[PDB]
Amino acid sequence: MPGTKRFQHVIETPEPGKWELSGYEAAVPITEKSNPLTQDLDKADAENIVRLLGQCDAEIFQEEGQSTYQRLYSESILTTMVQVAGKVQEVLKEPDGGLVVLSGGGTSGRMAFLMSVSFNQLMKGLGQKPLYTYLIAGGDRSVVASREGTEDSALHGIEELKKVAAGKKRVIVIGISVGLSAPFVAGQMDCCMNNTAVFLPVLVGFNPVSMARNDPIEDWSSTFRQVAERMQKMQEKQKAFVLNPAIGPEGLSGSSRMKGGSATKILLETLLLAAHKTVDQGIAASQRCLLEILRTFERAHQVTYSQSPKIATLMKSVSTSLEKKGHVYLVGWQTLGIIAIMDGVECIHTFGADFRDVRGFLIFTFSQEDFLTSILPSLTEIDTVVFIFTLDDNLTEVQTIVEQVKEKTNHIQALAHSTVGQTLPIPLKKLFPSIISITWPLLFFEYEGNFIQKFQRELSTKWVLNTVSTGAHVLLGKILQNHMLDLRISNSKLFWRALAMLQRFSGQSKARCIESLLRAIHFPQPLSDDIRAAPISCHVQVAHEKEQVIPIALLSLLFRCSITEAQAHLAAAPSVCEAVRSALA
Ligand SMILES: Nc1ccc(S(=O)(=O)N2CCN(c3ncc(C(O)(C(F)(F)F)C(F)(F)F)cc3-c3cccnc3)CC2)cn1
Ligand SMILES: O=P(O)(O)OC[C@@H](O)[C@@H](O)[C@H](O)[C@@H](O)CO
Numbered sequence: 372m373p374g375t376k377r378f379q380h381v382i383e384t385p386e387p388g389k390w391e392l393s394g395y396e397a398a399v400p401i402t403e404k405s406n407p408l409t410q411d412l413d414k415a416d417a418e419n420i421v422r423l424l425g426q427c428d429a430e431i432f433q434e435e436g437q438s439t440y441q442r443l444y445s446e447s448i449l450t451t452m453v454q455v456a457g458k459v460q461e462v463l464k465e466p467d468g469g470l471v472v473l474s475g476g477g478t479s480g481r482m483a484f485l486m487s488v489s490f491n492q493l494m495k496g497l498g499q500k501p502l503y504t505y506l507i508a509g510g511d512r513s514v515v516a517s518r519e520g521t522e523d524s525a526l527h528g529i530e531e532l533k534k535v536a537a538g539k540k541r542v543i544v545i546g547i548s549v550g551l552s553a554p555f556v557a558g559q560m561d562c563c564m565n566n567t568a569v570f571l572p573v574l575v576g577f578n579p580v581s582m583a584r585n586d587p588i589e590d591w592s593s594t595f596r597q598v599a600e601r602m603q604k605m606q607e608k609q610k611a612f613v614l615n616p617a618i619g620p621e622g623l624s625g626s627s628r629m630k631g632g633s634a635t636k637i638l639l640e641t642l643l644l645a646a647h648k649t650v651d652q653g654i655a656a657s658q659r660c661l662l663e664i665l666r667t668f669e670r671a672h673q674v675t676y677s678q679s680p681k682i683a684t685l686m687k688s689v690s691t692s693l694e695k696k697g698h699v700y701l702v703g704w705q706t707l708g709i710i711a712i713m714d715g716v717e718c719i720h721t722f723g724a725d726f727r728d729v730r731g732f733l734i735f736t737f738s739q740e741d742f743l744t745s746i747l748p749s750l751t752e753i754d755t756v757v758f759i760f761t762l763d764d765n766l767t768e769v770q771t772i773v774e775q776v777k778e779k780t781n782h783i784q785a786l787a788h789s790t791v792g793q794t795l796p797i798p799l800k801k802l803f804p805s806i807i808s809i810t811w812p813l814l815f816f817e818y819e820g821n822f823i824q825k826f827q828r829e830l831s832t833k834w835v836l837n838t839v840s841t842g843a844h845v846l847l848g849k850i851l852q853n854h855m856l857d858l859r860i861s862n863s864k865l866f867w868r869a870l871a872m873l874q875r876f877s878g879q880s881k882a883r884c885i886e887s888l889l890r891a892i893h894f895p896q897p898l899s900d901d902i903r904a905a906p907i908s909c910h911v912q913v914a915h916e917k918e919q920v921i922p923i924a925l926l927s928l929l930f931r932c933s934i935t936e937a938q939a940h941l942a943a944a945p946s947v948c949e950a951v952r953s954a955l956a
Contacts, residue, residue: 374885374903380586381867383881384874400582401440402550402627403868404620409853412622412845417683417690420842423622424629425676428834430619431634432669440579440617443638443665448616449658452638455573455612456646456656459543462502463650468540471503472532473639475547476522476555478628480507481713482635483547484514485706485829489822490643496819506531508555515712515735517719519861520915523908525558525591532559536569543571545639548595549631551576551583551615552864557595558588560602564611573612574602575638577631580613586867589906614638622841624854625868628717629837633830637668640826648818667814667823668830674809675831681807682835683842685784688755690843692782693728695753700746701731702772703759706825707788707832708733711759714836722844723859729840739768743775750779758785759832762793773802786835788828807835848948851876857922857947860892860914863907869914869921876955877928884928891924892917894934922951929954 385393409423435442442448462469471490473483483505491501507513508528509521521527536542544563546556551574563572576583580603583596605611618634621627641664645656676682689699701711712731718724732742750756756776760769776783786807787795795806809831816823844850849857856876860866873884886898892914893902902909914920919941926937944950 373900377904377907378881378885381870381881381885384877384879384884387878398582400550400578400584401617401620402552402576402578402582402631403625403871405624405853406620406622409622412853413848413850415845417686417842417846418680420845421676421679421683421686421838424838424842425672425679427619427622428630428633428676429672431630431637432665432672433619441615443616443618443634445616446658448614449661451606451612451614452642452645452661453656453658454609455614456642456649456661458571458573458609458612459643459646460650460656462541462543463646465541466500466502468538469502470536470539470541471543471545472506472535473503473545473547474506474528474532474556474559475635476508476513476553477519478632478713478717479547479549479553479556479635480505480513482632482639483507483545485709486636486639486643488706489640489825490647492820493647493818493822504535506535506559508553515716517716519720519859519865520911522553522555522864523589523862523911525554525561525588528553528555528558529562532562540569541571542569543573545573545575547575547635547639549576549627549635550625550864551578551580551595551599554588554591554595557593557598558591560611561591561593561598564598564601564605567605567610571610571612572602573614574599575614575635577615577618577634579615579617584864586863589908622853623721623845623850626721626841626855628721629841632837633833636826636830636833637665641665641668644822644826664823667827671827671831672834674811675834678807678809678835681784681805682838684805685755685757685807685835686839686842686846688782688784689729689839690846692753692755693724693843694847697751697753697755698727699729699754700750700756701729701759701836702734702742702756703732703832704734704761704764704769706829707759707761708736710829710832711757711836714833714840718840718844720859720861721841721855722849723857724844729843734768734772739772742772747775747779750776752780753782754780755782755784756780758783758787760786761788761828762790762795766796770797770802777802786832788831790824848946851948851951856925856951857919860911860920862911866907866911866914869924872921873925873928876925879928884924887924887927888920890934891920891927894923894938919947922947925951926954 435445487503487505490503509518548556560572563570583599585596602611645660649656703711715729715731718729
């Protein structure tokens, strides 16, 4: 029947009370789940939110129990990290025609970028040709843009991979997809396996292979699950690798920008730093080298969230300025400005927020005086600005821009990273009464740029800005339980999430939910057979452009009413959220 082909794989809604015993819950991949810690995220205050998201982030480093899934510290995972380090070593020894590609969509793509930079720096500072590069769904401009739509083509992913791998003789393709989900990566990984004389595919993500995505990809015949399952078979013979520790669900369900992005850094920095630092020692990388780095990254979470009350504040101030109708600027130097841009840009798709709402700036990439003459002008009593720099940066360029901004705002706060017993120029740096001073022990670093110190700092900042940005929006009443209900359906995955959110919140059948969602999307056109049988891309292309699609469909189901009636109901409510909450009653 029409639709059947497209919706066959969707599990039916369970009868109430049997969500567990139906085996529905067991079919939800770890990455897609509701985190139980955050069931009441919507109710928590800023200080609680920082606690709950810190707890959620800590789960990355939690160990395996005694019938269960491998984690970051499990032996099978560190073993794989070791073997991959080795394969990376082979390439570093023979850099003529070698290349290392890091590839993902969205934040996996953004993370790919940073790490390609860092490791390209590392080899530069040793007078080696840079062997790293990146790939992001939608080309290089995707790095600083909200472009959720571009990850759904496998032929695209393969094309971008053919370009960059030229007439190289030996390529390592690290495909990053947190959910083991992105058609962009799946095609890349599959092509790799079809030419193993040249390619070594290494898949990174945070679900068991058995929970890998399995609905059809429009321009490709295999599914992510098939591709991954076949990569796991090749791992015996050491010609593919799958690096897939569980780290537990995201605090905002499906928000893989957060733990997934962090885990991607932790996991990949760790393993690549090990590979480099141990080739010129003439020693194989060993579990023990990896562990040193991981434990350090794990200290970094403790250090970072020991500043929790100061973090909670910056949240409250960021939230205040958006409650009014202000704007928020995240001004940061080098690498950490980038992290800043990336957080701000991610607020657009994640929260359906305007590019002005949380903006990032690097010293998007503006000069000292340029920021001074351009952006400075429209700052205002209500806004918040954030300064993110180390004490190693060039604090004269810093002190200026804050001196100036002080006069227009007064809601400044800052984020400063320091080696132990560095001091903060200007003893009346007040300026910042209540700095977020994050201060780092001395570690023994032998590489010129102190990369471990860099990585730690990036991560700690990421953690702060993610918690700040995410918490700010929750506080504004925009998150339902721990779900972003009102998301813009901008790719198939979000489409599948919308449908799931309707089954879960409504409790009604799969057919009904599907009908209400498709009616909501294509309103005012009615459901025809063509529309039922259409490929998910056609629904995505049309939903991408509307507002409140999911809430409209949810009300049509709760009220057992038409779209015409549910739009009218919503318009005559004080807000979207109250319309939804009161109707969920
Ligand atoms: N490994 C992956 C990744 C993505 C996908 S997906 O794009 O096809 N889609 C992802 C999200 N997804 C779900 N999203 C949300 C839910 C919820 O129930 C939960 F509470 F768990 F978050 C929600 F309440 F939000 F709806 C469930 C799923 C889900 C449901 C059943 C099977 N698989 C995923 C459906 C599958 C499938 N497999
Ligand atoms: O790495 P995945 O599971 O393939 O996810 C890829 C992207 O969709 C993901 O990074 C998304 O853009 C983020 O907004 C999620 O917070």
